[PDB]
Design a protein around this nucleic acid. Sequence first.
RNA 1: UGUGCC
Length: 1073
Amino acid sequence: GKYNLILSEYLSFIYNSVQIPIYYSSNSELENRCIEFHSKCLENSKNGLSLRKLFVEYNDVIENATLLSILSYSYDKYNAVERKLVKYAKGKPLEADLTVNELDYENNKMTSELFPTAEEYTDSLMDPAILTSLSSNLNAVMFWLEKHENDVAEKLKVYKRRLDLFTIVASTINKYGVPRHNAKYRYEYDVMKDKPYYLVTWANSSIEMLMSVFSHDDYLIAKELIVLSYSNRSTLAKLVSSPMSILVALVDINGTFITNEELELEFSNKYVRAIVPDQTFDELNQMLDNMRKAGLVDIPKMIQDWLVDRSIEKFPLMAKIYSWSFHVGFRKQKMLDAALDQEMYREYTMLIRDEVVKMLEEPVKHDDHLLRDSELAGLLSMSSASNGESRQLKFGRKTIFSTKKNMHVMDDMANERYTPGIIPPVNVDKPIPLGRRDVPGRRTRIIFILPYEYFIAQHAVVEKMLIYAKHTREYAEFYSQSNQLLSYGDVTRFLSNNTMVLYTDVSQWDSSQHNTQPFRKGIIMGLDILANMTNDAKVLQTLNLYKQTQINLMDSYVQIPDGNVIKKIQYGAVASGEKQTKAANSIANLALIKTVLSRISNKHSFATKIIRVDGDDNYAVLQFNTEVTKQMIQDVSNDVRETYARMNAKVKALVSTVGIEIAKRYIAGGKIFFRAGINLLNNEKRGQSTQWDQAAILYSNYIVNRLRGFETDREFILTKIMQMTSVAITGSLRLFPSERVLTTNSTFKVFDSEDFIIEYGTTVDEVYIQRAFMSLSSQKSGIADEIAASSTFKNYVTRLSEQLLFSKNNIVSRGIALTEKAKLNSYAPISLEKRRAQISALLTMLQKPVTFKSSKITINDILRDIKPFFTVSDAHLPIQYQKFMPTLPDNVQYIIQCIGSRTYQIEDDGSKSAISRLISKYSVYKPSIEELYKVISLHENEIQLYLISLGIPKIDADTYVGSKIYSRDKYRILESYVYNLLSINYGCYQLFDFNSPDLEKLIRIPFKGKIPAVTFILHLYAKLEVINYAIKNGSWISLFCNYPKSEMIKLWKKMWNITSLRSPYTNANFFQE
RNA sequence: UGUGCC
């Protein structure tokens, strides 16, 4: 509960010249006392009197009531920051070395020198894009510094290392003064022109980096990145994190974890000697020298010191550095610059064509319905993103403009303009609008934003390909319900003294111009073969349309802005934006890896243990009929690079016998590592999310980084959360939500009271608050109801429905209309109205909690009912599993050591149900987990009607409605739904093997009735409680359950009526992946 | 409506 105490100190620190606590209680009499206390405090403050007497008088309110919020009556002028900053600003300011970046505008010049006229100015290249101010970040660091000013021992060293660092930030910022932000947390030209262009972004990155400093090594790393970053803005991250690929090959393997037949992690005590050719060492040295040429000193030395022995025990430092560089911010070039960079492929093209044919061969011959009604499927699937051009649209009687894809389709249909049979051009006549994706370290890549004709003409086929991939292991990113651990396991498996791994990053090749010809032709050739396999008119048109999109792309043109103008240039390369983007790319890399491997063998004779393609990378494990030597590696590597070289492909191929390093993960010393480079105080782009959503997201980013090996002080995160989640009443009245409001599992939850432990209200007050918050979950929007009543809109819903189902409409119909009413949420005007409504409702709720008829049950209610029926008792679980994921914090790591981990994801969509499968066979419709959950619990007769209404044949529908499988499905649908409400596949839990035998013994549950749903919830609740206790106390306990027989029947009724809560915390988990 | 595909 330290969050509440912390908030007062921070507020007291920020303002000085009052704070009014606000409590509430589920007990009528106590609440009145809370009302009396609030009135007295306002009255006393209004008269400038002390509140000390009142606190003693209302001792009971402080002691038992639950704090809801804090009132901030501050009469200053959001200043203080200028005054506060100066004491810390003494050291010498930093000077921008305007000679380190190629492209001029990437140097820390004076804003004016970049944009002389306020009309030439643009933040397009430095916009933090986050909804929190630079001034607030600075305020947070200073506040933390003051609190930890009088600390001792090791704590002091952390303060001192941090204090030194912020000195550079403070002094440099002062030389120009703190920049001021507008209403939308943006930095305009007037504040900007006197100050160095990249000043605001740089300060944010350094502050974020410093508040994540603890050990001396952290201090050394943060300082080099900070000073260097201010000058360098385009290669520092890349230079710092490049030696990592070379490093993995060096470390030896002493006991690793592999994959077994049951596809689960199993420990192997083997030893694999690292074999590295002298040439590789020269390459690493060149990389180190390059870091040095760029002013780097401390970082290069650390890598060099490590190299003397390359002990996997002193390797965490290398890992720490790799995670660290990403925190220098994003590299945002000029669209044109990002855009500008851009006879033997016969074997390569053929494989791509063959792979495409396999993925649809069976679907095409049979005459799959999805292929037949592909157009309908695209419409249901259709998103609410952009279509490319801002159009004027009329809805009922309102004339407004939108760019949204959904809006364009509805307007077009109501004008006989809807024509998916005609796939628009993307050449010189109708150039493609561009989209951009920015990431730290790597170069900016462009994105096509093609007309919805393209999404529709490709949605059905890509879905078919994904299903094929779903069961093909070569495609690591799509295989089964696998996670990254299984992939990690597969590489280690066949590792021995007569086998070498081959990893390759082909990010450059994917964009190449050489690539697009062979790529498009291969897909097209495949499409022609598939067409020569059926006679179905519906299938051919859908198949034919897909072919057309590939042809139009072959010769494309792009609209790249060059200032304020839009130059139309010829883009002869493959860019992402299509539907088949990921699936096609995966096919292309796999075809490519296969092509290189085949050419090499003519020379060498090996065995292919495994081949894989995962994202922009691809790798393989080969086996030779002899012991691998340093000389052998050089020969295999030179030939492989040469094979890539002949195909004019620019890639980075490496050969090792112990580890590999790709974009998503890296393996060194038999251990699995994952980069932890998520930016905190700077984003990639702006969206339509609120401050609360962003605050929830920041906490999430912090949790993933903390899990991955990059920790940022929690107090700083908490401090950031307090500033972000605040709400102003006036220009001097600001309301700060309490910890209970912030952390309770409600529609307004932002973070967990205690990291790695999701709590649920076990007290009456929490329950009272939870019920109240839900009360005001959804808010109305006029602009939204308007269009929801217009003609064109209802017709669009009606046209989709009369095309989909046969019999009656409503469980399906209500969903389609709503699913379509929400898509309007991309339209800012509607988004803005919703937020304003939420705040006003929120201000009143914090002020004085309202009443609620409840009548709605949730997950928290089910858990609360169970709790009082378990008996706790100290138990003990020894550690049996060696550590394979080192970066993991100690408390999280301990649970894995004692009970183990898993290599799969727990099905939380119900897709593995027989009924869901049956719907898939005859319908293009895709029910949600929630819809399936409501549907399964319906009267046998009702279910039969619903299946028929969707097109399911009578003999099939009738057979299911009474079978054994339907009964089993009932339990399965609920199990999937319950896991979903408990986020078992997210955060820290996704790691633990909840089916662990060791975990299982700690649970004692005697059957007293026997009813699937009831048994599942008790075991799950017990498993979560035992694990959570373990996370907090580092020790274990055993659980006994004596739940009544009468009680279970009541509980079961409760279970089939659970509602789902929507909250920023929930959104953030969805947001991560 | 400072707007940006899968």
